[PDB]
Design a protein around this ligand. Structure first.
Ligand code: ICS
Ligand code: ICS
Ligand code: CLF
Ligand code: CLF
Ligand SMILES: [Fe+3]
Ligand SMILES: [Fe+3]
Lengths: 522, 385, 522, 477
């Protein structure tokens, strides 16, 4: 039943008595459900240490991964260039999933095309698919560039991207001068961030490999900034703002900020902003190239150091206080511009906030996950705040990155209880937070289920989730946030301290039970 | 086939099989066999509602995968699949069956998932369903539906053929093709069981493998999604002689008509119960119409089964595919929002719902009035422009 | 008892068994506590409509007021000027309370002095106190200006501020040219915002009344912006940023943003930034004066219109979409500058966020309170969002302001169930949210207790509090937020929609009971 | 560090003042001599503040409503006058209580007369009677009403005593008028005195002829403990594990009933001498009840106070005291072993109101910390007599210190930690010196007793050794 004045959606409509009776009869008559005592026993077993050993003995089964496949990162990288059309050579369902994923995260239109390779292409390849797709895509969506990645089927059948593009240009499907950079993005190697690296390196190779004769390092008095796989618009904004404050000439290569934040004014813009082709062509002339996320831009670093001859600085991600300081000092050294008083005042205000919130932030325990650079920056920032990142999970991290994070943890007294897990998924982390319960989790929306599981064990066992990372699906407009620089550090500190304060308020809201600690002033 | 490089909404066979058909089976564990991407992008993407303890006896919103790497591609993943099945048995003992949904590389590397499934199922006495639903097969999710239906037929539907212990009643019906998006199947089931009928089976939405096995015992098969289940309905008519009929619970007129049509297949007691249910629900949807039709009368709708509710609210559907409003997916939602037209997702019901039934009609009308008459759409042009 | 590995603070230390037994023994043996059945009966009665009628029949008792006294706002106004010391003529307890209040809201030092009027001055007046205090303050804290307000003691006694300042200057206690603007701030008249208006009018009159002979309107080509009583630093910043983007000369009179956000860099800054005396002197030369919060700047508006001859534009607070739009059109008309593409893009992005979140924001009910302009801006924004502000409470609002808010509500279909309450306090609002339960409340930290009360009735009766306004004591660094302009509307919208989504997540986190609606995507 | 250096520092700090202010403020700064008993020959206190010098003192209303009367949970306390005084003092003090707020407890609530101009011009006695009627109507489970006068009440000639008499007689309710106008006295100290006199004259003698309370030889009353963060509960659990019966608590988590039962106790354990010595002396002279001061800050003071209290009773209480001390020795020994190596040798400067500047020195010394400067907002000369022997030789003492004076002393002495109120916290935090709130315990605590000592050590270590203090200087500056 429904009431017209108060219409109930599925919650709490399905909590009504008739629906409960119908569901109970369905379950007891036809579902053959296990007894509720058996379900409770199995759940309690899954929350135990022995189940944790069984879970960590896994070698072939992945449950709830914390990563995606390369072409998603390749598409995100391609979206960062001016009037550039992402094009995945292979199966269409991959492109549908990529567009849906980015649509749900950014709440924005996401442009990506596929050449719709079918069973026939499993025999003679997708050469005809490449020709028809390039021709039709250029004719219909009129991009200045088409950036080509691959699906897993194309990598398995061994499609040669370069030869297919050359034949498409030779047979007149597309003009020979039309820029079509490509990158092989095998979805069974690495993850989405690897795809971002591959796509960016392919585009840089396309525009700069054959034009190095006239290039002189530091002739346009600019610094190249390579952001990497980045799903916070505020991060691009803060890097650009901090560089402009310093008066430092910069080129943000693969900037998707404009196309991921198109205003609603009555018209749909397929393309907006982004790195121009002239910027990519002039990139070797810069003083240097700074990689914002060095741990998934290895191929890009190799190309920039080996072709552009840029001495890429060994910089951490500009996350937290110390690493933002190092980034600003290195930018000052490269460009010669002194750090302005505005940035010094912003740093002092961040330090003021840390000082104000340190009592509530001290000793708190966190289980966190995400991409390597973001995770390591979060670990550094938590160590700066006196927090304890007990469970550090990076499904797409490697041994060298784990070594770096362990070195970071060893330098701080708050990294004593920390452990880094590479190759593990969110089921491993669910076991970890059941057996060694932290105060909070930090991660994407997929962690919301872990919290639910903890709440099933008991309110005292519940580990609340803080949504920093990618993807965030169950909250709106969190992609607009910042995690880089002093501004990102301030936002993250505010989020952490206020999450602690909401949790304390919830725990002390019981009148005559716990409300003696329901302080007005905190 | 789809024209290359034109930007299709269309999904793949894997999305049709795992995402649509097999996935909502709650007590079964579904393995996305292959690289991580397909499983990760489809995890909890569809709102096929269910009742259970996720991770213990229900696994719908979880993502199990083989996480294929280069070594698995080069040397095959059959040994990996067998080890994965052993680990699934070890860590999820209350699973009542395993499905193995193939991804694109599985077919191309010559993996024999059928032999692995047969051997492991014989060893563990468990039903393991190999589904050859590689994404490159076919041109859309329709072949995924067909392959999933064939898998259901070959591996699940007929394992209780000899069984007779089930006590069948003359009013046994099975809901087929209703995936319980936002609780739609529950809202249909409440009306059907208010009619005196007994929904023995309801798959895939909030569906159990046991009630899939109990489907050949029902007296009538009520098919909502004809496209994804016509194959199994036809096979069930040919093999078990069970009549299957289509129904529509979208909008008060359509659900009244469907209830009468379904009751006409049974004796007069069911027809009397149908009349009682229709009379009982008449004031509710009548009041909903009185409230919301003046707000939505004379409004044109474009879309890409549901026309009945729109017309019952006073709307005019001037566009459909496979204006004052556009109803489509998430990939077109923001594109149409930026051109300034109010938009509704007709795949997840904009995370609202249910929409089927008399209860769902109130939610549907509220949502249409909310989106179409929202003040945000009149604030598009800056006053200085 | 404590374990040194996990030391418990008061929560949850006092939940231990021995503390529970000790508290029970104390209550049963010595407190003569009412029976728990009687207590529950009385609470349930307080949640009813009959109790609401009794509560709203109040005429002499005020319970949990939503306002402060004039000298607090006067001190805040004085804080907005360069090297200006706030000086409250009267008793020191008021100054201690003002400084503590602003310290807890801003988490920053707040400088203010008193002349310590003692009962020996309760008969003879505070002339000697004024002389000694002015001399001591100027000698010790070296301000370029001393801005004088009064406590209730001095107002009741009837101390003549003008004569006392003149006698202090005449007797050589302070130099004749030293600026000592003053204002009478009776704490029994109006509220803190009235004090801000009185202090600003005193300073403007001091610096301008005797020098209007050479003033010409529009000669400096600037616009005067009067913020009023403002406790969000982001509001000052957003006004300055929007005006700078438009290329509009402006003079933010009483800008306390710098002094309330000093960096923590090893030194203490008593003074920072602020409106200069040259700016205040040249203010009459401006084209016009725009009041950000006109409903508590009546005296300032009267003075500006009658003395500076500025035709003050009838403008609402720049809150929400339409009012920010109107503010930008008016500023463009006054200054002649066009509205740049960046502000148009920001408006379009705010509209985009509105269209993204309208499904979750539509039909939600809110009980809100605060200062008059803040709450009318909040009501207007909520109407723009499709929300229903069912309970609008303004303890310091008047009848004409209520007429304005009712007119605002009448223009919207979503203000049909909205009621405006002036002269009512938070106990009235508690009765309102019990008898007519909204989805959320919007207000200061004082609302948290209301939420606790609602939670005592039941989880289905709990009304969550969204902390927007002044003061916020139980959360950290929310004073850095923005509520004005497109950016302020963005922040408010994000907070509202994520509050709704967090509440929905909490309601549907019950495993096998409500988690059927625990959607990953929302 | 040396006495001559401290005196020279005092002189150069005083150099900025005008002549009258410098002459007055010279008498309130001193170099501690622990061998001096009469501090009147060394320091001067309980005098009016110098005008316009950023004093930290509150008012008499703060000392009465905010300190003594407010913590009483079953009583409703009316801030009589305009809205400011009640609004700024609402829930700002963490005097913890157990109860149902709004029904039978009203501590965190703000009741006020909300004086308008008409109430100033024509008086508010009629408004006060109407307000009492409204309070009775809307809060039936209150056990009494107190009327704390704000500044205008005394000046406009209001007679709250007559209204309290009439309404109490009519409603059979204990209505206590308190003339605690802010302009009275020089600080919160006269507020304490006025509140104590009000308690004596309106509450304490209610059950003088009542003999229905079964009294035991072990009846004690805790006086001057306002349960800041639960401190009174941490003291009470220790006292009751010792075999004593805590009949009353003054006034944190205190009820009017146990205040009325205080004349029946055998001993008065006074924690805050400054705020409740008046009522302790009155109870001694009227009911013959002995009173003794006790300190529960840190294990050393806690053990010494427990033994001193147990020495007032039979040998069974002494045996139970030894049992409690033996029980709690491992806990605070582990706390010390964990935290003292982190805090050993660190110098602390304190400036709190009237008792804690000397009471918390033992707890700090239990962790190896040294207090180099202490001072009071509103203490009297007896408090300084008690303080001088507690502080070390040649340490700094300040009475009613100014903001400028405190800043200059901190800049010169450069302590490792400062413990003061919210008005100094951010000043000294921007200066790079770790700060602890010694009024509200930085929204932590309790600090009394052994559990309180564990919390105190954790807080001191967490703030003093926080990494944020190594980051105030930009690496490029
Ligand atoms: S199965 Fe089909 S796209 Fe028939 S693949 Fe798709 S839950 Fe749609 S129009 Mo999403 S043929 Fe169902 C469908 Fe219809 S996932 Fe749902 S809404 S009624
Ligand atoms: S009552 Fe006094 S100022 Fe003795 S007015 Fe003050 S809760 Fe202080 S040093 Mo705030 S004489 Fe208590 C005090 Fe001490 S409010 Fe608390 S901490 S032990
Ligand atoms: S059409 Fe369908 S969704 Fe596409 S791959 Fe093929 S089965 Fe799968 Fe998979 S990991 Fe990523 S998303 Fe692909 S590139 Fe491969
Ligand atoms: S010394 Fe003390 S706190 Fe001051 S007034 Fe007097 S009793 Fe009160 Fe009150 S309303 Fe505001 S804060 Fe004052 S100016 Fe009057
Ligand atoms: Fe959007
Ligand atoms: Fe601060």
């Amino acid at each position: 039943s429904q009431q017209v004045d108060k219409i109930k959606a599925s919650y709490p409509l399905f909590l009504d008595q008739d629906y409960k009776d119908m569901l109970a009869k369905k379950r007891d008559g036809f579902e053959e459900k296990y007894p509720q005592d058996k379900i409770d026993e199995v759940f309690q077993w899954t929350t135990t240490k022995e189940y944790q050993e069984l879970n960590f003995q896994r070698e072939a089964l992945t449950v709830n991964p914390a990563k995606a496949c390369q072409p998603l990162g390749a598409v995100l990288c391609a979206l960062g260039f001016e009037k550039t059309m992402p094009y995945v050579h292979g199966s269409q369902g991959c492109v549908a999933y990529f567009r849906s994923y980015f649509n749900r995260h950014f709440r924005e239109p996401v442009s990506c095309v596929s050449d719709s390779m079918t069973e026939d292409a499993a025999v003679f390849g997708g050469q005809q698919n490449m020709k028809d797709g390039l021709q039709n895509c250029k004719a219909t969506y009129k991009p200045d560039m088409i950036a080509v990645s691959t699906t897993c089927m194309a990598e398995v059948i061994g499609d040669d991207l370069n030869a297919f593009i050359n034949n498409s240009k030779k047979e007149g499907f597309i003009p020979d001068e039309f820029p079509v950079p490509f990158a092989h993005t095998p979805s069974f190697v690495g993850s989405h961030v690897t795809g971002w690296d591959n796509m960016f390196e392919g585009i840089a190779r396309y525009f700069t490999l054959k034009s190095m004769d006239d290039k002189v390092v530091g002739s346009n008095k600019k610094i190249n900034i390579v952001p990497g796989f980045e799903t916070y618009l505020g991060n691009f904004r803060v890097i650009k703002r901090m560089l402009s404050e310093m008066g430092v000439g910069y080129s943000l290569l693969s900037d998707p900020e404009e196309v991921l934040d198109t205003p609603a004014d009555g018209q749909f813009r397929m393309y907006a902003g982004g790195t121009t082709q002239e910027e990519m062509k002039d990139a070797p002339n810069a003083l240097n190239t700074v990689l914002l996320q060095p741990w998934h831009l290895e191929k890009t670093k190799k190309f920039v150091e080996g072709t552009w001859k840029h001495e890429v600085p060994k910089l951490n991600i500009p996350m937290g206080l110390d690493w933002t300081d190092e980034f600003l000092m290195k930018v000052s050294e490269i460009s010669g511009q002194p750090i302005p008083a505005s940035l010094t005042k912003e740093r002092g205000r961040l330090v003021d906030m840390m000082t104000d919130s340190h009592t509530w932030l001290h000793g708190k325990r966190f289980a966190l996950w995400g991409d390597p650079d973001f995770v390591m920056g979060l670990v550094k920032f938590l160590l700066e705040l006196g927090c304890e990142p007990v469970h550090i999970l990076c499904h797409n991290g490697n041994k060298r990155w784990k070594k770096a994070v362990d070195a970071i943890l060893a330098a701080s007294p708050y990294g004593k209880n920390a452990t880094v897990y590479i190759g593990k998924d969110l089921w491993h982390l669910r076991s970890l937070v059941f057996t060694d319960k932290p105060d909070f989790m930090i991660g994407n929306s997929y962690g919301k289920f872990i919290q639910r599981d903890t709440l099933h064990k008991g309110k005292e066992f519940e580990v609340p989730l803080i949504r920093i990372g990618f993807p965030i699906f169950d909250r709106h407009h969190l992609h607009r946030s910042t995690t880089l620089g002093y501004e990102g550090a301030m936002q993250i500190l505010t989020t952490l301290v206020n999450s602690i304060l909401e949790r304390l308020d919830e725990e002390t809201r019981g009148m005559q039970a716990t409300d003696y600690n329901h302080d007005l002033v905190r | 086939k789809s024209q290359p490089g034109l930007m299709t909404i269309r999904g793949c066979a894997y999305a049709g099989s795992k995402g649509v058909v097999w996935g909502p089976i709650k007590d079964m564990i579904h393995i996305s066999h292959g690289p991580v991407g397909c499983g990760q992008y489809s995890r909890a993407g569809r709102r096929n509602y269910y009742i259970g303890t996720t991770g213990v006896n229900a696994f719908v919103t979880m993502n199990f995968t083989s996480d294929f790497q280069e070594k698995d591609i080069v040397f095959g993943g059959d040994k990996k699949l067998a080890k994965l099945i052993d680990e699934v048995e070890t860590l999820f003992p209350l699973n009542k069956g395993i499905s193995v949904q193939s991804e694109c590389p599985i077919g191309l590397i010559g993996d024999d998932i059928e032999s692995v499934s047969k051997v492991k199922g014989a060893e563990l006495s468990k039903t393991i369903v190999p589904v050859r639903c590689e994404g490159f097969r076919g041109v859309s999710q329709s072949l995924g539906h067909h392959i999933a239906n064939d898998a259901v037929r070959d591996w699940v539907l007929g394992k209780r053929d000899e069984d007779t212990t089930f006590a069948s009643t003359p009013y046994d019906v099975a809901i087929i093709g209703d995936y319980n998006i936002g609780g739609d199947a529950w809202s249909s089931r409440i009306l059907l069981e208010e009619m005196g009928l007994r929904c023995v089976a309801q798959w895939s939405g909030d569906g159990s493998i046991s009630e899939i096995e109990l489907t050949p015992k029902v007296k009538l098969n009520l098919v909502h999604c004809y496209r994804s289940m016509n194959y199994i309905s036809r096979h069930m008519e040919e093999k078990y002689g069970i009549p299957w009929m289509e129904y529509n619970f979208f909008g008060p007129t359509k659900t009244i008509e469907s209830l009468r049509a379904i009751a006409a297949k049974f004796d007069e007691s069911i027809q009397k119960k149908c009349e009682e249910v229709i009379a009982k629900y008449k004031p509710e949807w009548e009041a909903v119409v009185a409230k919301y039709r003046p707000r939505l009368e004379g409004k044109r709708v474009m879309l890409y089964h549901v026309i009945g509710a729109y017309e019952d609210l006073g709307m005019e559907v001037v566009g459909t595919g496979y204006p004052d409003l556009i109803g489509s997916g998430i990939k077109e939602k923001f594109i149409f929002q930026k051109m300034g037209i109010p938009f509704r997702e007709m795949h997840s019901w904009d995370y609202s719902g249910p929409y089927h039934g008399f209860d769902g009609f109130a939610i549907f009308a509220r949502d249409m009035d909310m989106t179409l008459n929202n003040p945000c759409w009149k604030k598009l042009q800056a006053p200085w422009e």
